PDB file of C-alpha atoms and ligand atoms in Angstrom:
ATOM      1  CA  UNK B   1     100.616  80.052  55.881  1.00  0.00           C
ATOM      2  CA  UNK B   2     101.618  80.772  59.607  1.00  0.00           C
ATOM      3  CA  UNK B   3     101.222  78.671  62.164  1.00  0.00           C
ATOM      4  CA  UNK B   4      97.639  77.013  62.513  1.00  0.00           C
ATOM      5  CA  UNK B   5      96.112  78.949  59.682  1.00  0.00           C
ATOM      6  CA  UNK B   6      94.116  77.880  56.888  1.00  0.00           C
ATOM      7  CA  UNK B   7      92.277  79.312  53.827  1.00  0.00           C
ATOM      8  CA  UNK B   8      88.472  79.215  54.042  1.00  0.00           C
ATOM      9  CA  UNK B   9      85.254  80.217  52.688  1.00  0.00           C
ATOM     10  CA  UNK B  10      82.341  82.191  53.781  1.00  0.00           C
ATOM     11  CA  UNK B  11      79.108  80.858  53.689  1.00  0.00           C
ATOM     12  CA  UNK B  12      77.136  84.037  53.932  1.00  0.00           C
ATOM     13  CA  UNK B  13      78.951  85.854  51.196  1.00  0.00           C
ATOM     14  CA  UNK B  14      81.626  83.887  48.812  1.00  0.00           C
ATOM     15  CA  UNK B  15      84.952  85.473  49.934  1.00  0.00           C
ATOM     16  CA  UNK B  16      88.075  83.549  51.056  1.00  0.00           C
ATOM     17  CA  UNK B  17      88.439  84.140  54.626  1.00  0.00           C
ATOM     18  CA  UNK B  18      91.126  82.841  57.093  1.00  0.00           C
ATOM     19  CA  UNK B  19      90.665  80.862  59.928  1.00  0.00           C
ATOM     20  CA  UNK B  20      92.677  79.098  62.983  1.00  0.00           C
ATOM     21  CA  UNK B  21      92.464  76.460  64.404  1.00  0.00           C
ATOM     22  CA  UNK B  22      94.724  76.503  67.458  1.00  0.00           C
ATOM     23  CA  UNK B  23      93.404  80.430  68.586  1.00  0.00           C
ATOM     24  CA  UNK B  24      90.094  79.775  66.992  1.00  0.00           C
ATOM     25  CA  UNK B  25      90.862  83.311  65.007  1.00  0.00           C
ATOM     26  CA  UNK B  26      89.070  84.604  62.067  1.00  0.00           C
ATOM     27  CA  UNK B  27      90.034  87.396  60.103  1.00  0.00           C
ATOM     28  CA  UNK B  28      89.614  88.219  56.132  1.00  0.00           C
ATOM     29  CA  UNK B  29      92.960  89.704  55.239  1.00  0.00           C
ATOM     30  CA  UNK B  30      95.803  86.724  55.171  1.00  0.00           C
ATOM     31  CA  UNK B  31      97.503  86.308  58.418  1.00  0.00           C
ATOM     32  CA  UNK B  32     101.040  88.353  58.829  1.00  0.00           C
ATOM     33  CA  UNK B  33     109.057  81.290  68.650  1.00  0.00           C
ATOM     34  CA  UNK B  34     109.117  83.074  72.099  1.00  0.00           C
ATOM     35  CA  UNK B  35     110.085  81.646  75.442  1.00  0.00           C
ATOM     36  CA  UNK B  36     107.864  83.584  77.365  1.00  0.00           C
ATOM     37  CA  UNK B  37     104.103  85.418  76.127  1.00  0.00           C
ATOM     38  CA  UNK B  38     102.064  88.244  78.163  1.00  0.00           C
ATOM     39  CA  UNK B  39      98.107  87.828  77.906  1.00  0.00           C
ATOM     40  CA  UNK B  40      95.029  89.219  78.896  1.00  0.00           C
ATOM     41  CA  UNK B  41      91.476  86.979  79.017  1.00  0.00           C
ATOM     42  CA  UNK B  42      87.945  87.311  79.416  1.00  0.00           C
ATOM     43  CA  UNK B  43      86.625  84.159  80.893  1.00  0.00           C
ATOM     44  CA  UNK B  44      83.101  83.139  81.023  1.00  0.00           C
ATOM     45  CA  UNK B  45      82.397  79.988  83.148  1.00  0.00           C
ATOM     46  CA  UNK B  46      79.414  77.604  82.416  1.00  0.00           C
ATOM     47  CA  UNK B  47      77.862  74.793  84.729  1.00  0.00           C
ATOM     48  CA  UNK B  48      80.378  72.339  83.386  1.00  0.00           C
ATOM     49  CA  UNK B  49      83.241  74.291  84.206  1.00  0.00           C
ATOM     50  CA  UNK B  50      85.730  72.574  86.675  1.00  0.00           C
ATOM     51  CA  UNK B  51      84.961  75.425  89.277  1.00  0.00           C
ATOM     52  CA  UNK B  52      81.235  76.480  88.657  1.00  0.00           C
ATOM     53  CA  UNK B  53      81.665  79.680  90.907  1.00  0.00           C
ATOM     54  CA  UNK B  54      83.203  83.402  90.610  1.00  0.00           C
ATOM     55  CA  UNK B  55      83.642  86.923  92.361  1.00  0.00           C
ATOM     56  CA  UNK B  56      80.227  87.873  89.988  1.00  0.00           C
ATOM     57  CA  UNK B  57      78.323  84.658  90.942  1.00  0.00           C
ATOM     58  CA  UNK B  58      78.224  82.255  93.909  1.00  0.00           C
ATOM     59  CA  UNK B  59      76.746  79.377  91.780  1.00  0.00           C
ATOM     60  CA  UNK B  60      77.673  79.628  88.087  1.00  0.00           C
ATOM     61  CA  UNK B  61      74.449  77.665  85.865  1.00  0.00           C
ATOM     62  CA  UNK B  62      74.306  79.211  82.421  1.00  0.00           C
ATOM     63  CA  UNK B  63      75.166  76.341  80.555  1.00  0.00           C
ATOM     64  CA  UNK B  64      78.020  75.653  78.031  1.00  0.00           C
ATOM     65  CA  UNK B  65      76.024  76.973  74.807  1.00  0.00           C
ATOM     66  CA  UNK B  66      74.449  79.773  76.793  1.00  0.00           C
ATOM     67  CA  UNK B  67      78.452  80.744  77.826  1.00  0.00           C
ATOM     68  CA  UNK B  68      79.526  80.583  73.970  1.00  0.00           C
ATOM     69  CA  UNK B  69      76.898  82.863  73.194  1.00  0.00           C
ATOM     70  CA  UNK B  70      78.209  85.600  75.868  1.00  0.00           C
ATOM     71  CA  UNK B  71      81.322  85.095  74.317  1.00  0.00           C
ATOM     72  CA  UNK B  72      80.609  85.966  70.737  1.00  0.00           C
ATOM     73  CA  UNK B  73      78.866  89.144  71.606  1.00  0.00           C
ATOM     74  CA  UNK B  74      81.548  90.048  73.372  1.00  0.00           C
ATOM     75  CA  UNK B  75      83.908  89.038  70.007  1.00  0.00           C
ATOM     76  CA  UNK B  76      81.377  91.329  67.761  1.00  0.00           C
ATOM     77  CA  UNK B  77      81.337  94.366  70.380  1.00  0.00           C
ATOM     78  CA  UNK B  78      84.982  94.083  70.950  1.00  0.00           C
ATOM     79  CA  UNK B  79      85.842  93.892  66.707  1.00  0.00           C
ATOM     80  CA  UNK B  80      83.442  96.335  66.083  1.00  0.00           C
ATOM     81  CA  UNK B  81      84.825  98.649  68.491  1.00  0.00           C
ATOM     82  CA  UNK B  82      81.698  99.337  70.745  1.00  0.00           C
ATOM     83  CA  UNK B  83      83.561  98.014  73.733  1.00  0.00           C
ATOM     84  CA  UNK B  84      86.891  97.624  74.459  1.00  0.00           C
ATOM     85  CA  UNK B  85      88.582  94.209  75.911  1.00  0.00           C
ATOM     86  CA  UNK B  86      89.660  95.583  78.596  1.00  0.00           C
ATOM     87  CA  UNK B  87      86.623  96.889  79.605  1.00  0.00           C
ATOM     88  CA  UNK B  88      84.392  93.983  79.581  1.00  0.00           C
ATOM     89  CA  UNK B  89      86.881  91.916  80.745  1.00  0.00           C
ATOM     90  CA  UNK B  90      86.961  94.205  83.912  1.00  0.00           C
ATOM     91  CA  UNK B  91      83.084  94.087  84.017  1.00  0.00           C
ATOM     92  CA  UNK B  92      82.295  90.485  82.708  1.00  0.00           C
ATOM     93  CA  UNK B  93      84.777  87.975  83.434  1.00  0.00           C
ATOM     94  CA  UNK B  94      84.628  85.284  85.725  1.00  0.00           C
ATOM     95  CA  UNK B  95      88.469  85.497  86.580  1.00  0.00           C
ATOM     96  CA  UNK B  96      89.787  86.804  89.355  1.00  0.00           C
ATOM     97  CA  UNK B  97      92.108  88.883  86.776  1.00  0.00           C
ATOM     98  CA  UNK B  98      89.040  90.836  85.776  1.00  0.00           C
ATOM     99  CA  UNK B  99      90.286  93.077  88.424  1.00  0.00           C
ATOM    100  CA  UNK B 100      93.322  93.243  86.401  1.00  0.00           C
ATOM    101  CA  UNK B 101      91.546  94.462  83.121  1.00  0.00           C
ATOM    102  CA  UNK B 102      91.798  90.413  82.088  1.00  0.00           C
ATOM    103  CA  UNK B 103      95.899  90.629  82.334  1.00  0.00           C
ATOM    104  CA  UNK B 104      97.292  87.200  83.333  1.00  0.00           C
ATOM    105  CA  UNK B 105     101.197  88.638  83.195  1.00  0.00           C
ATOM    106  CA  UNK B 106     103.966  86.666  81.309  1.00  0.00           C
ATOM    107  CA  UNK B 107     104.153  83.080  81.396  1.00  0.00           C
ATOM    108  CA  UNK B 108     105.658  80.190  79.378  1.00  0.00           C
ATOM    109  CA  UNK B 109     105.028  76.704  78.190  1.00  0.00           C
ATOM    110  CA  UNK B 110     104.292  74.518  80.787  1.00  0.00           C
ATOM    111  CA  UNK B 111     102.169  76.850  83.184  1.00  0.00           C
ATOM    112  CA  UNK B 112      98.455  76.544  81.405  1.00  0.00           C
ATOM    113  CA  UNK B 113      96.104  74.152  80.968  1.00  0.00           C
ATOM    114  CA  UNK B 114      97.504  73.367  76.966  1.00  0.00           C
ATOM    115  CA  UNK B 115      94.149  74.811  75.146  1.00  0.00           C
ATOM    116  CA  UNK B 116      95.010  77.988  76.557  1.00  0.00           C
ATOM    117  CA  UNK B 117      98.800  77.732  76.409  1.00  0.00           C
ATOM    118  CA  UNK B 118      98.809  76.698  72.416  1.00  0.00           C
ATOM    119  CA  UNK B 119      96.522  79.747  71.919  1.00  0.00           C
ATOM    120  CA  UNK B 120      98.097  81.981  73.558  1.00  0.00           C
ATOM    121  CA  UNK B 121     101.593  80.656  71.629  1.00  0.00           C
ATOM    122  CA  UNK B 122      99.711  81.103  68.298  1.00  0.00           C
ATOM    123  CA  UNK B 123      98.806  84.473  68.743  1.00  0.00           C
ATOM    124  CA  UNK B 124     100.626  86.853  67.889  1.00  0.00           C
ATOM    125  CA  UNK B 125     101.639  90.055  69.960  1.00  0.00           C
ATOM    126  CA  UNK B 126      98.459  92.645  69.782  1.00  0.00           C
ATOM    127  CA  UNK B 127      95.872  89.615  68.605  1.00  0.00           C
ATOM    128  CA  UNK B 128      93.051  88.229  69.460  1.00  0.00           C
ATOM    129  CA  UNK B 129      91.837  84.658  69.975  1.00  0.00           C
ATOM    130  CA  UNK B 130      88.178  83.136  69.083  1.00  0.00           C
ATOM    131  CA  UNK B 131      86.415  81.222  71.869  1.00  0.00           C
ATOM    132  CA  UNK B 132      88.935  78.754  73.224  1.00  0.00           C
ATOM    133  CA  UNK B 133      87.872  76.172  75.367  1.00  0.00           C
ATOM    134  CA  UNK B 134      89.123  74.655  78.700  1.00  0.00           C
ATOM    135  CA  UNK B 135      88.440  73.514  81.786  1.00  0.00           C
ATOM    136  CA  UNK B 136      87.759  76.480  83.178  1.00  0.00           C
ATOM    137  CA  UNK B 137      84.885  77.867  80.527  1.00  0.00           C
ATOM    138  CA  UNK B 138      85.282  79.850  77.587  1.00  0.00           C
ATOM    139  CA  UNK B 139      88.114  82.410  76.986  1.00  0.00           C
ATOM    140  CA  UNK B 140      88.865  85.456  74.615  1.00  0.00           C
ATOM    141  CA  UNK B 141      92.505  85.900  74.975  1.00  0.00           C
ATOM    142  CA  UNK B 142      94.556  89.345  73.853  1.00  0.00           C
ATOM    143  CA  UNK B 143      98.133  88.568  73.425  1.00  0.00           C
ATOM    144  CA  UNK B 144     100.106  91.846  74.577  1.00  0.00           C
ATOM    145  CA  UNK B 145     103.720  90.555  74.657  1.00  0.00           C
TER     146      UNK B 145
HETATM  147  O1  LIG E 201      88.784  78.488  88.779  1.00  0.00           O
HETATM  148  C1  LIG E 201      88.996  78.479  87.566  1.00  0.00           C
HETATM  149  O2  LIG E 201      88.608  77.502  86.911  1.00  0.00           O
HETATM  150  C2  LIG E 201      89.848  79.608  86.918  1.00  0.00           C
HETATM  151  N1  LIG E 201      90.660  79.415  85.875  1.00  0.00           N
HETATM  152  C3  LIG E 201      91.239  80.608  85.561  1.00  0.00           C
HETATM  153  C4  LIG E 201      92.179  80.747  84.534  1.00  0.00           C
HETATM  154  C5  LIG E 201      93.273  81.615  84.680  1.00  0.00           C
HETATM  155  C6  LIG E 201      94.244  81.737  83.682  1.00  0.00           C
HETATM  156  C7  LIG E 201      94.158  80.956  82.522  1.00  0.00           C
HETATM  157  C8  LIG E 201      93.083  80.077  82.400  1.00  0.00           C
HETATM  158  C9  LIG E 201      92.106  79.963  83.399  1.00  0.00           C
HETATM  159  N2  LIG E 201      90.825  81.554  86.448  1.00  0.00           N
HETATM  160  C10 LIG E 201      89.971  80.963  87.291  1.00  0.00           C
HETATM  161  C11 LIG E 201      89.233  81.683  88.442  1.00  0.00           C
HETATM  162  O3  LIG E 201      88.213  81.179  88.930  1.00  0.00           O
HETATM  163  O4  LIG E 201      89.629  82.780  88.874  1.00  0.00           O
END
């Protein structure tokens, strides 16, 4: 398979699945380079993140579990359809870009911290990354370009 992309299992029900391990992605249906990718991100900082501040909060302290969590409910409302990315990226993030529905504009190899760079690389245009970890906190990134 594609880049990153293995075959896996599901514990709750039996069915092949397929994860990755570069965007943190997991989808069921089997999956399916450029100079240059366009992304948006939702960013949610924790008390271990390099900068533990943002335009929401003066003094980020959630902690790094407590930050994952946050995350993955905003995965399930976003996949579900609830709420879309751009939305609670706009409401929720803890990057400046928030004002910017989450959207980063294009950049290439070289500009990220690497986490974020080889996710956004292994995405491909109009997906969606799991929780992907840097520096910073924890990131949902949309690929757009
Ligand atoms: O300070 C931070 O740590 C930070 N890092 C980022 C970020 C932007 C693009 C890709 C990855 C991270 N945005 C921020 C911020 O507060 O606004």
């Amino acid at each position: 398979l594609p880049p990153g992309w293995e075959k896996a299992m599901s514990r709750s029900s039996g069915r092949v699945y397929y994860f990755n391990h570069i965007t943190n992605a997991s989808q069921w249906e089997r999956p399916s380079e450029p100079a240059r990718v366009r992304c948006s991100h939702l960013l949610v900082k924790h008390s271990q993140s390099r900068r533990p501040s943002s335009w929401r909060q003066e003094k980020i302290t959630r902690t790094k579990e407590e930050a994952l969590e946050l995350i993955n409910g905003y995965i399930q409302k976003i996949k579900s359809g609830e709420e879309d990315f751009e939305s609670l990226a706009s409401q929720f993030s803890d990057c400046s870009s928030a004002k910017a529905r989450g959207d980063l504009g294009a950049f290439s190899r070289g500009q990220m911290q690497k986490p974020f760079e080889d996710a956004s690389f292994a995405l491909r245009t109009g997906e969606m990354s799991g929780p992907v970890f840097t520096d910073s906190g924890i990131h949902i990134i949309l690929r757009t370009e």
